[PDB]
Write a protein that binds this ligand. Structure first.
Ligand SMILES: [Ca+2]
Length: 223
């Protein structure tokens, strides 16, 4: 996250870190057994780390649970990043508490102008590279589809939305991928892609979670 703020420990209780020996992507806890992340984060050998603040220090609220199964969306296209969503099942159920909590799925899509919370452990610099140990946060609005499509000609599908600031300076970044965009208490986006980070006229692009609620629910119901 570039241009954000330190969230505070366990203030984003649905945020998970995906770990394969190191943090590599975010995700969102949606029930005691399941995490939503980006399909481009897929890899084998995932450990889900819940209850994290400093990802390099054991602080006392963590739960580390191996993934038993990951399910990339049936129509994910890695070239275009269309349908950039996956589900990860935990080998054991998380113990839910005030610091480890699921986030609700949306019932309808969000609208341009709605202010959302984006979080992660990704790069905090737009030029250069600095990875934080503690969780970072950014409040940002959803942008109109027309402005999104104008910013990225030929690239924005109906399964994507833009959020952030056209002036630059405030965005998600590499290492935030797969993490949450939460608006009014609902998971509306997944950190997906962008041109660089925090660049003028190049806002963040996010997977449009509302389009996937039926798939999510039916997948959980049979897995
Ligand atoms: Ca920790």
């Amino acid at each position: 996250i570039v241009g954000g703020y330190t969230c505070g420990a366990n203030t984003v209780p649905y945020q998970v870190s995906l770990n394969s020996g190191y943090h590599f992507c975010g995700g969102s806890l949606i029930n005691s057994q399941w995490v939503v992340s980006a399909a481009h984060c897929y890899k084998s050998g995932i450990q889900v780390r819940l209850g994290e603040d400093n990802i390099n220090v054991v602080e006392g609220n963590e739960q580390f649970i191996s993934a038993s199964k990951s399910i990339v969306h049936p129509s994910y296209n890695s070239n275009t990043l269309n349908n950039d969503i996956m589900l990860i099942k935990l080998k054991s159920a998380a113990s839910l508490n005030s610091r480890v909590a699921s986030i609700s799925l949306p019932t309808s899509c969000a609208s341009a102008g709605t202010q959302c919370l984006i979080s992660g452990w990704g790069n905090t610099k737009s030029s250069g590279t600095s990875y934080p140990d503690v969780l970072k946060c950014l409040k940002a609005p959803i942008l109109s589809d027309s402005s999104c499509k104008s910013a990225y000609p030929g690239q924005i599908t109906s399964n994507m939305f833009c959020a952030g600031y056209l002036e630059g300076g405030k965005d998600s970044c590499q290492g935030d991928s797969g993490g949450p965009v939460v608006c009014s208490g609902k998971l509306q986006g997944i950190v997906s892609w962008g041109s660089g980070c925090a660049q003028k006229n190049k806002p963040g692009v996010y997977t449009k979670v509302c389009n996937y609620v039926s798939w999510i629910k039916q997948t959980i119901a049979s897995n």
